[PDB]
């Protein structure tokens, strides 16, 4: 929907930009912001949850050529490395593809919440905005943002500007 | 006048906690144990031919 | 009795994919892991009902 995203939004991570009679203005939705954060936070905490301890291991550098045992000590440690390396590449990749879809869904979800709220008093413009079909002054706007907009109130006004 | 129809899912009085990517604990309707944690303390003589070096 | 997995600690059933009894095993056995419990979810998120 939103082709783009807003620079200069520093109140939070997701927000509302309105335009009415009283003028334009902006404001962030803190709840769906923290919702994204809390997930990234916890995901991140699980990744860096403190690793293993290891003490006396095998030797991994060698001065002289010993043949068979040394070939094996080097093969064991290389095999280890290659695997752990794969684990880390895959981890990050998965975690990231998720962290993206997580945050794209958060925006997405806020939009729907807002659409179900307006019920039949507004239409989706196509770029992730709403054309609200009534006089929605600044009190009314925050009433939407903070989850209290009663549609049953502006129904008649809106419904009629929409249809004839 | 009109009518109301609601879509819903179940839930249960005592769930079980499990882990996910994002979440350390999260209650779900049911889960299952994947790690065999205890033993019978004795060795079964089948189907493997056991021989006791006494 | 019948048991396709043997350990020093005794015989264990291999109905699970992992085990925590002993790293020494013989036969068709679950893979030894350091974890003593891993719960796999077999149902949806459990949500109690709102109120009123």
């Amino acid at each position, epitope marked *: 929907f939103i082709e783009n995203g807003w620079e200069g939004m520093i109140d*939070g991570w997701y927000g509302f930009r309105h335009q009415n009679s009283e003028g334009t203005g902006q404001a962030a939705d*803190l*709840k769906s*912001t*923290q919702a994204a*954060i809390d997930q*990234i*936070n916890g995901k*991140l*905490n*699980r990744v*860096i*949850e*403190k690793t293993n301890e290891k003490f006396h291991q095998i030797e991994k550098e060698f001065s002289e050529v010993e043949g068979r045992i040394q070939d094996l000590e080097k093969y064991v440690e290389d095999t280890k490395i290659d695997l752990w390396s794969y684990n880390a590449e895959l981890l990050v990749a998965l975690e990231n593809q998720h962290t993206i879809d997580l945050t794209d869904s958060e925006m997405n979800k806020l939009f729907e919440k807002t659409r179900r709220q307006l019920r039949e008093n507004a239409e989706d413009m196509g770029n992730g905005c709403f054309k609200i079909y009534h006089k929605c002054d600044n009190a009314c706007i925050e009433s939407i943002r903070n989850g209290t907009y009663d549609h049953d109130v502006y129904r008649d006004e809106a419904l009629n500007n929409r249809f004839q | 006048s009109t009518a109301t129809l609601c879509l819903g899912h179940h839930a249960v009085p005592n769930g079980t*906690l499990v*882990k996910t990517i994002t979440d*350390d*604990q999260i209650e779900v309707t049911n889960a299952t144990e994947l790690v065999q944690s205890s033993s019978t303390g004795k060795i079964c003589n089948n189907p493997h031919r056991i021989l006791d070096g006494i | 009795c019948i048991s396709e997995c043997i350990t020093p600690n005794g015989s264990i059933p291999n109905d699970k994919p992992f085990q925590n009894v002993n790293k020494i095993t013989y036969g068709a056995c679950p893979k030894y892991v350091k*974890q*003593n*419990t891993l719960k796999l979810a077999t149902g949806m998120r459990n949500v*109690p009902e709102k*109120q009123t």
Partner: antibody
Amino acid sequence: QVQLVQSGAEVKKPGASVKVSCKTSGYSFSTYGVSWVRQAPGQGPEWVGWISAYTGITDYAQKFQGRVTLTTDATTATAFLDLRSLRPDDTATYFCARDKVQGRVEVGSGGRHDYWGQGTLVIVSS
Amino acid sequence: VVLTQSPGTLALPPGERATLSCRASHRVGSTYIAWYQQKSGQAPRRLIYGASNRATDIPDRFSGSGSGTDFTLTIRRLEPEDSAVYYCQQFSVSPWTFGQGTRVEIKR
């Protein structure tokens, strides 16, 4: 510096309810939630609930749900705790404490119950 | 998520080592554990966060550790200052829960 001054001991009778204040200072009120823990004399602490001063979100312990209401006043920088239908069970000392970090980057868990109220006694007797 | 911690009380002389355990009924991130000390009257004072780290202004006698289900707090060389109750707490899973409480009496 950073502190949490709670209200003085109240005394209430089996039916009634109660409200306890927790005044904060020395840190920006809105980037951190508040946790509430109570303590029946001689027993150990049990958790009551948590409220975010950033998002207004709450999580009550399911033991109390219904009876308990957490709120915050950003102007005075104070968290409040309202408990209704007081049983004599609820006779305890009630603590508030800073908890979770909100808005800000993230982690790990550096508090998470950094600093605590001096405690505030509630007696439910007839 | 139940934290049963042991031993009940324990009495040890000054300059000895108390070793407190905290077994949890379910597995828990090492990051969502905390330990507290409480001398009766005053409010709980927080020793350790994330299972491993000291909060500030805390002597290094105090230290913590644990993996998944067994968390432990070690006071490395006791003082008479340390006679108190100690609580482990987890806040991974609502309801955030506390331990039974291990008492420490110094045995003079």
